[PDB]
């Protein structure tokens, strides 16, 4: 019952409510029309909706992951096997409840993740994730001892936007280019990376470069980080150095030209392995090594 329109409505909004959250809410609303009890009508419709979303998707898996999570939750729901109405009611409730949970998660983050800041340590935030920014803000509020650093990111000018946002706060800001990151080995103290998806074990999807950063960190023996809230748990694993669903072509040796037509093509998306990251940042207590995989195992049983 319409998802393309919803997609159209949300792309550069975020800020207040997370992009994925809105999608989740929409999914919940869709569910709460055709009845979750009648599984014959419902699950097929859900599948169709997912397919539609995929069709509408260019360069993302996050939405797909969210919908899978939702499905899993729904599956879990009916395990009371008694009165069938209460479960339905609960299902109906869990949509805006999810949104509410986000605030709580943020609050939790503002209490557990504020222990990390030490004497003279330079912080560099990679990509675009709201949670990381919130954490940074909360650290600033606490006034431990830090430095907030930005990047020259290249999707649709994200890095610049981030820099501008930082400027609002007031904290002194200097920039790092995608190429000029190589000089950073010990001076910027700890390497932080924001997430737009967390897979099985160490697998994280963001923007136009993470793997290289991870490699650099490994070389330097630097502390590498994955920072997020709570809505991104995926069952995924790649085979090569990098493997993902792609709309932007990998190594597209552009056709013979003289007056310019199409050129901006390459690895737009980036993955990270298990070995490179030292710490995982989620509101779910204090979990790090391979807890997400365990969670997945608990959930799927497949």
């Amino acid at each position: 019952f319409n998802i393309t329109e919803t997609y159209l409505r949300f792309l550069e909004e975020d800020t207040e409510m997370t992009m994925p959250i809105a999608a989740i809410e929409a999914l919940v609303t869709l569910l709460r029309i055709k009845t979750p009890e009648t599984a014959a009508e419902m699950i097929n419709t859900i599948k169709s909706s997912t397919e539609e979303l995929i069709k509408s998707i260019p360069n993302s898996v996050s939405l797909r992951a969210g919908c899978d999570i939702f499905m899993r939750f729904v599956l879990r729901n009916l395990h009371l096997y008694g009165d069938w109405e209460n479960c339905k009611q609960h299902l109906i409730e869990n949509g805006q409840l999810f949104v509410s949970r986000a605030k709580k998660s943020r609050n939790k983050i503002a209490e557990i993740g504020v222990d990390f800041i030490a004497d003279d340590d330079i912080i560099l935030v990679h990509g675009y994730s709201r949670a990381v920014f919130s954490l940074l803000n909360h650290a600033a509020n606490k006034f431990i001892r830090f430095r907030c650093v930005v990047t020259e990111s290249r999707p649709s000018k994200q890095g610049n936007q981030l820099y501008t946002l930082l400027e609002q706060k007031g904290i002194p800001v200097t920039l790092i280019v995608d190429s000029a990151v190589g000089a950073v080995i010990d001076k910027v103290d700890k390497v932080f990376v924001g997430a737009e998806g967390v897979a099985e074990s160490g697998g994280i999807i963001n923007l136009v470069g993470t793997y290289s950063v991870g490699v650099l960190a490994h070389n330097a023996r630097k502390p590498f980080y994955v920072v997020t809230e709570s809505h991104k748990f995926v069952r995924m694993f790649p085979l090569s150095s990098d493997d993902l669903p792609m709309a932007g072509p990998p190594l597209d040796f552009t056709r013979r030209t003289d007056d310019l037509e199409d050129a901006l093509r390459g690895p737009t998306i980036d993955y990270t392995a298990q070995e490179y990251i030292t710490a995982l940042i989620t509101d779910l207590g204090v979990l790090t090594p391979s807890a997400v995989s365990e969670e997945l195992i608990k959930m799927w049983y497949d």
């Binding site: 004497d119 006034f143 001892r145 830090f146 430095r147 002194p172």
Partner: protein
């Protein structure tokens, strides 16, 4: 200068022979050292020393208060007392002199106070710390580079510094300091 006591001491029994306070490092007027002959031909192992520091800590037996009561001349406890003991006012009595390789100083002046504070801040005495917290409302925490910070403590960015700094609670520190 106030207490540079020249302790003539024993190794076999650890017992004092002479006490003197001199203003010699500050005002060269009365540079003087005496060796009393009353306990000269009984000890034999005479050791001349000066490099020792005041603590003013005493474990006292049943003798001391009675002695005090007896003799009203001892209005003090260091310059008169030890000398009296040496002289045998109460005839034939022993005193102990505990000698430790580890550092021990008492509170006296202002520079000395400062030194004591510095020692406390550093790791000069075996365990002594503020971060352990003693008095109820205390929220002290240990930091690297010999730095002490309580809770509600803030120092701002860009302050290129030497070595060793400590801050109390309820403090707000600005920017750009040497």
């Amino acid at each position: 200068t106030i207490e540079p006591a020249a302790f003539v001491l024993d190794k076999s029994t650890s017992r004092c022979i002479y006490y003197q306070d001199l203003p010699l490092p500050s005002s060269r007027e009365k540079t003087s050292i005496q060796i009393d002959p009353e306990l000269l031909d009984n000890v034999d192992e005479f050791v001349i020393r000066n490099d020792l520091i005041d603590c003013r800590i005493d474990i006292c037996t049943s003798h001391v208060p009675l002695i005090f009561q007896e003799n009203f001349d001892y209005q003090s406890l260091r310059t008169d007392f030890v000398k009296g003991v040496i002289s045998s006012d109460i005839l034939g009595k022993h005193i102990y002199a505990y000698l430790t390789d580890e550092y021990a100083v008492r509170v006296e002046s202002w520079q000395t106070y400062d030194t004591i504070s510095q020692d406390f801040l550093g790791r000069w005495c075996y365990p002594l710390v503020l971060d352990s917290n003693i008095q109820d409302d205390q929220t002290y925490s240990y930091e690297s580079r010999h730095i002490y910070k309580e809770k509600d403590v803030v120092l701002a960015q860009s302050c290129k510094i030497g070595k060793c700094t400590a801050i109390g609670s309820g403090t707000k520190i600005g920017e750009g300091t040497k």
